[model samples]
Target chain A: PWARLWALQDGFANLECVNDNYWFGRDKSCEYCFDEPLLKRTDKYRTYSKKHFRIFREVGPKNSYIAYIEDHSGNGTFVNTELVGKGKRRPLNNNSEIALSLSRNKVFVFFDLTVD
Target chain B: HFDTYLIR
Candidate 1:
């Protein structure tokens, strides 16, 4: 599992956990999903499982939150260095860390939460 | 540069 981050534009962003064919490889219409061409090559990553999770954000003072919603079935998650079980949403504040782990040694993708 | 993490 390799993680990538993009800055949000208008106070809200939806992180869609996608598969290799949709994320890396080209579609049937010959359209590349990811902007980077090098990422289209599948060999660069380790675990290519469908264990996907989504993190959504809403911007404001009180209403603003970093929320994790599991999109697929796989290993567990960690929010703010604490274990959050599968298929659950954890609301987080600023400067939180989200980690998705497949195994102890295999795949661990980390996201550092920050607001600007 | 970022600040250091403290464990002390």
Candidate 2:
């Protein structure tokens, strides 16, 4: 069936089982709502970090395959690495490696997933 | 070089 249609479209296929607040130390602002952009920021650094986008997994400096995401719940979406460190936030253009936290249930999808 | 560098 086409029930998994949305799952197939996403690069992270395992998002099917992701829950709320999957990223380590982040808040509910990261939730991804398809209805619309959860936040409104006219500037680059004005992003609502806590309410930006939901991370399907958990990561940190100890990890390699980092993933950063930011979008308005609709189109202007962005994802990559470099969104790590306490205050080091990356813009929505370049690529950088950053760690995040994922749910225990969804960790098995990716091989060599580790964190501190 | 300065130890303090901003990524912007």
Candidate 3:
């Protein structure tokens, strides 16, 4: 098992998975798309990148399946309000708040699911 | 405007 994500924003999708390597964005071509029209129209809609971000897992020391978030956005992706920026990656922590574009625009709460 | 297989 890897992780889970609970959408916090209105009309956002609540998603979870035992596997890593997820693609997220506004584009339906993405593995995981924020396709909620309400969320699309929720704002002015230009802030989100077509390809926004992804969460992937790599083997860590011992049995840890360390999860990392990589931002591939025009604006930015955030973990706990800390911007990862475009072309950058950051380790994700349990219960971390994930946001897109604006830090205030928190969309999901990431839950670490790796058990020792 | 979406990939039917990809979009929810």
Candidate 4:
């Protein structure tokens, strides 16, 4: 486990980043599938695509595999306070606020365990 | 509608 996603709201369990590619959303096949139990009751009927986003690592300025988040859903993915529109991506901080669909709907706060 | 930086 390299990183972890700490839930910002209740009901959402914590997720560990085990691989370079971590797929998320309502799909059961995704690495971090947001199953019914993992989602808020009110968010169930919401527009959560089969695949919302993906957190991947690539060569970065730090000369290491830097974590990045990519948006793939019809709605949107938010990194910090910025909106990552469809098919877009953004670098993540050791601590990053991750939201789905809406900016105020923060789901997780990313945490990188490894120290340079 | 895209609004992000380089990916890939």
List clashing residue pairs in candidate 1.
none
Which of 1 and 3 is ahead in TM-score? 3
Ranking by TM-score: 3, 4, 1, 2
Local error of candidate 3 at A55, Å? 0.5
TM-score of chain B of each: 0.55, 0.43, 0.31, 0.18
Instruction: Estimate, for each residue in A1-116, the C-alpha lDDT of model 2 and write its tens digit.
Output: 10111221222223232342333212433333222232122222132233333334235578833433333211122223222334333332222222222111121122212231
Off by over 4 Å in 1: A1-48, A58-66, A69-73, A102-115, B1-8
Per-residue lDDT of model 4, residues A19-48, tens digit only: 788898767788876665534355432556
Rank all candidate structures by their DockQ, best first, as comma-separated numbers. 3, 4, 2, 1
Which 10-residue span in candidate 2 chain A carries the lowest summed lDDT?
A: A1-10
Candidate 4 iRMS, in Å? 9.6
Of candidate 3 chain A, the 10-residue stretch with the lowest lDDT total is: A39-48
- Winning model by DockQ: 3
The model with the greater DockQ, 1 or 3, is: 3
Error of 2 at A115 (Å): 9.4
Off by over 4 Å in 4: A38-40, A61-63, B1-8
Task: List clash counts for every candidate, in order.
Answer: 0, 18, 0, 0
Is model 4 an incorrect, acceptable, medium or high docking prediction?
Answer: incorrect
Interface RMSD of 1: 15.1
lDDT of each: 0.36, 0.27, 0.78, 0.76
Q: Which one wins on lDDT?
A: 3
Query: How high is each candidate's TM-score?
Result: 0.38, 0.20, 0.84, 0.81
Q: Give the lowest summed-lDDT range of ten residues in model 4 chain A.
A: A36-45
- Over A1-116, each residue of candidate 1 has an lDDT whose tens digit, in order, gives 12234322222123332322222112223222222344334332222223444454444467643334332324445554565565666654444454434323222333433422
Q: What DockQ would candidate 3 receive versus the native complex?
A: 0.05
